[PDB]
């Protein structure tokens, strides 16, 4: 029947892809990186602790000026912090207390949030009345929101738990594009440096390189043995890193189209909740469930430090645009600034 | 040191922290419960867009029970005081799955300090079925525990089966308690109006036991 021959064709194509990937691989990154000087011990100390959240912290995002940031917690508050002086610029109450993501508009006029309400809420920070108002509510997803990222003041990409991403137009509220093809729930996404591409990792242990313009899955990457919780582009937008429940990080390269390096150790057995890079893409700041955040040497995979100051699991972390400080949230309701 | 404008910014920060404290004062005055169970378990009978919150007040104490593909979201609930678990006393043999489900809850890494209230629903159906077990061969070699206090006018076989199910749950309950959380079982029928005081008292002595363990008195 058609089904059988189609199955043989599909498995033949899969094996051909695997064989091509194997052929393209000649020298590993580790072999080439045998002569570069080691990074050396990395010592980071806390500089600010931001208290005021009532419950666990779910998401965190910097501003583009490297000074303001926004955080969301279980209590239903979205708080804007002036990291330099530890001031509360804004405190926004949420209609729904189940929020799992937050974003800060690259221009700085809006913030975004969402969660188990399946709706993405956009808040205007610069009203003429002197307050903060709900600018827009985007609905249409059939599942909970996992991540959202602004492209500009008018466009925002969102990833839901129904295995589909989206690309909205905020003025109207209608999805100009839809991305489908994942098997499980999508847990994260990461816009490219130029905003022309983005990736996403799902519960099916796979990552897909999408295309915002039209919406075709350019490439698919596999190799993780469990869910992928966090994803991030390399600073040059020509690679990315994925963190999963199997206590391993993986560095994928888009051009070669296969895994390059794995960051793991036997004495590490906990999952990974968040990853981030450094301004030069030489450090990889993973966030584990054992309350710590190892600092991997991206080009050698040999650890170079730890950020051990949190009393509970680290649920999110981020690095500023200028690469001057790294913020980390956690389930004890405190954000910490490090450098 | 501060400028004329930075002082006003700090004043705004303080006036925000004031409202944050005012909200925290009420956040800690409520007890959060996680009602759980299957569609046919009888949750709707007990309650007397993926989340169904609820509010009620017992003796000037406010509760925030909210009824809720479970491996992820339930993990983010390590702050509640008690979990209300509803099971059906009738064995398709889906009951085993319930047991398995219970096991998954007990051994979860982030739920090792949350005690579980257990409701064993549908007593009338179980009694009718027994009067009119077979799927668990271990029921043959089971003797009713001496501590049992069966209700008057009850056949000893119904008591045998009922306590067999209850102890089957308590077996996985007591395996690895470690003293940080326990299980509070109850035999709730279809028409029962006292199910709220049971949750009240169980939530009270959960906290009493936590405190006692803090003082090393238990």
């Amino acid at each position: 029947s058609e089904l059988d021959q189609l199955r043989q064709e599909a498995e033949q194509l899969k094996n051909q892809i695997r064989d091509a990937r194997k052929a393209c691989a000649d020298a590993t990154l580790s072999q080439i990186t045998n002569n570069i000087d080691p990074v050396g011990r990395i010592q980071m100390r806390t500089r600010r602790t931001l208290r005021g959240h009532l419950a666990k912290i779910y998401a965190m995002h910097w501003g583009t000026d490297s000074r303001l940031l926004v955080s969301a917690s279980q209590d239903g508050k979205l708080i804007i912090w002036d990291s330099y002086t530890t001031n509360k610029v804004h405190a926004i109450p949420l209609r729904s207390s189940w929020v799992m993501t937050c974003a800060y508009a690259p221009s700085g006029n809006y913030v975004a949030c969402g969660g188990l309400d399946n709706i993405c809420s956009i808040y205007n920070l610069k009203t003429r009345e002197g307050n903060v108002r709900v600018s827009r509510e985007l609905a249409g997803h059939t599942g909970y929101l996992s991540c959202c990222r602004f492209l500009d003041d008018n466009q925002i990409v969102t990833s839901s738990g129904d295995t589909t991403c989206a690309l909205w137009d905020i003025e109207t509220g209608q999805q100009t594009t839809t991305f489908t093809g994942h098997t499980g729930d999508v847990m994260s996404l990461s816009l490219a440096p130029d905003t022309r591409l983005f990736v996403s990792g799902a519960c099916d242990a796979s990552a897909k390189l999408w295309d915002v313009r039209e919406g075709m899955c350019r490439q698919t990457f596999t190799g993780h043995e469990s869910d992928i919780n966090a994803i991030c582009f390399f600073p040059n937008g020509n690679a990315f890193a994925t963190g999963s429940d199997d206590a391993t990080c993986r560095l994928f390269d888009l051009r070669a189209d296969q895994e390059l390096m794995t960051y793991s150790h036997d004495n590490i057995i906990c999952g990974i909740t968040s990853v981030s890079f450094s301004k030069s893409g030489r450090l990889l700041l993973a966030g584990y469930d054992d309350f710590n955040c190892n600092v991997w040497d991206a080009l050698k995979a040999d650890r170079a430090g730890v950020l051990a100051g949190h009393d509970n699991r680290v649920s999110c972390l981020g690095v500023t645009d200028d690469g001057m400080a790294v913020a980390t949230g956690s389930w004890d309701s405190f954000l910490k600034i490090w450098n | 040191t501060l400028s004329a404008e930075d002082k006003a910014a700090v004043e705004r920060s303080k006036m925000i922290e004031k409202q944050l404290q005012k909200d925290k004062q009420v956040y800690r005055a409520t007890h959060r419960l996680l009602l759980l169970g299957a569609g046919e378990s009888g949750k709707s009978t007990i309650v007397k867009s993926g989340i169904f919150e609820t509010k009620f007040q017992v003796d000037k104490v406010n509760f925030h029970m909210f009824d809720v593909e479970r491996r992820k979201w339930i993990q983010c609930f390590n702050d509640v005081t008690a979990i209300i678990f509803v099971v059906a006393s009738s064995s398709t043999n889906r009951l085993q799955e319930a047991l398995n489900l219970f096991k998954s809850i007990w051994n979860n890494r982030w739920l090792r300090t949350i005690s579980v209230i257990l409701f064993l629903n549908k007593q009338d159906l179980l009694a009718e079925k027994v009067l009119a077990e077979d799927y668990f061969p271990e029921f043959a070699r089971y003797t009713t525990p001496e501590d049992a206090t069966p209700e008057p006018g009850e056949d000893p076989r119904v008591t045998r089966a009922k306590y067999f199910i209850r102890d089957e749950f308590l077996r996985i309950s007591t395996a690895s308690g470690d003293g940080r959380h326990y299980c509070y079982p109850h035999f709730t029928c279809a028409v029962d109006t006292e199910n709220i005081r049971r949750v009240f008292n169980d939530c009270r002595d959960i906290i009493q036991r936590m405190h006692l363990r803090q003082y090393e008195l238990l």
Partner: single-chain antibody, 236 residues
Amino acid sequence: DVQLVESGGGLVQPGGSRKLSCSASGFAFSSFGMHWVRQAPEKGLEWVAYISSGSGTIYYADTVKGRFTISRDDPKNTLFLQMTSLRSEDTAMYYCVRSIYYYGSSPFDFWGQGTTLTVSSGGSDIVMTQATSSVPVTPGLSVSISCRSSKSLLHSNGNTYLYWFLQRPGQSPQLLIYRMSNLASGVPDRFSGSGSGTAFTLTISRLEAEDVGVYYCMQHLEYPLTFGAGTKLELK
């Protein structure tokens, strides 16, 4: 939508007392600190009072301290000024001003209509200097106004608290530049602010006929707030 309507003016005999009220409608009143700023008839602006958000800080000018008392009523959105023992120098038009302070905000960005008060006949403060006090201009030509300060306004944190206001004939002032380089909201981008330390210059390009009025500089570095004499732009 935003309105600040002042009332309670008129004729007063010397030594009497009066009350001025400011009804605010169209914005979150409780989130804004308020100022009373007065202008004598043939003179420039002069700061008078200040009451912060929540009534937790009240400042008065040295010329009115003891006599004038400022207050606010948030529930019904009103601002009050009680004046007692009125001299003959308290003849002026009074303006109600709003101001919000947080990182990156724009203070002094809305002035009320103002109310007139007439009374029948019977130090270490920073001084702002506008040496030039008149400039004739023609449409389509670039202008340059200047202000000078007795003290360095550049604060340690990196700010420079200097403001620019434009009063047209018959209308209340209007914010143009805040902190000497940040253009306000709703102002054409031809205006630009500059300066360093103690000398500041406002440059105008593509001048039109709707830019005729008096231009004032003000300092927010430390209280009291002090205005300039007021440069005037004349039509050719």
